């Protein structure tokens, strides 16, 4: 099922499958079958060619997805980046942005640990 | 599933209510 931007989720349940798309989560999915009538309990493989299209044409003409989201965000980041925006700076430095601490647990934004030397006391 | 603020036990933990744990 070549749904959404170049993607093919398959052999799995419908409601799960969609999750696989950049724009679709465990919310939009169930709300994209409620709007169709397709019973999520069925597998992608057991879809009526028709059933399939309905999905496609919906999904694409409404929610931004991969081909277009990864863009809006990318540039959205640059938005404040271009301006002397605090939040921006945090983006340049590769630190937390939403307001965390930089003395400990922040390894998710920095990644591997960069161990430096210290000094004696004994 | 105690940190997934979008699950049953998720709210139970934080003690909040939302679209996943309603008031009945």
């Amino acid at each position: 099922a070549r749904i959404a931007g170049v993607e093919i989720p398959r052999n799995k349940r419908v409601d799960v499958a969609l999750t696989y798309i950049y724009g679709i989560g465990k919310a939009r999915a169930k709300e994209a079958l409620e709007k169709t009538g397709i019973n999520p309990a069925t597998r992608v493989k057991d879809l009526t060619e028709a059933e399939v299209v309905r999905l496609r044409e919906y999904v694409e003409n409404t929610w931004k997805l991969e081909g277009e989201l990864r863009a809006e965000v990318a540039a959205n980041i640059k938005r404040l980046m271009d301006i002397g925006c605090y939040r921006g700076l945090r983006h340049r430095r590769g630190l937390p942005v939403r307001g965390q601490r930089t003395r400990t647990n922040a390894r998710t934004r920095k990644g591997p640990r960069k161990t430096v030397a210290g000094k004696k006391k004994a | 599933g105690k940190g997934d603020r979008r699950t049953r036990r998720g709210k139970i933990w934080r003690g909040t209510y939302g679209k996943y744990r309603p008031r009945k």
Binding site: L80, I83, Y86, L89 | -
Partner: protein, 80 residues
Amino acid sequence: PRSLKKGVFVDDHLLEKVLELNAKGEKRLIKTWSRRSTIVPEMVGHTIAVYNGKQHVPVYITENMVGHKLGEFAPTRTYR
């Protein structure tokens, strides 16, 4: 994802102080500590100087940076 419900906040200190700058046209430099305030479209183009911990960094305002606050333009922490 931050928010101030229904009623955007700006300090009357410079609000009514900035509007008195439109009657004449434009100005050059403004200085007011209130960084608490959100930026209004009616301020665009002005050159406001906001206070750091000790300094007074001037901030030029643009169309694309209206959705933000003054403080977002005043770095307080000196680093590297």
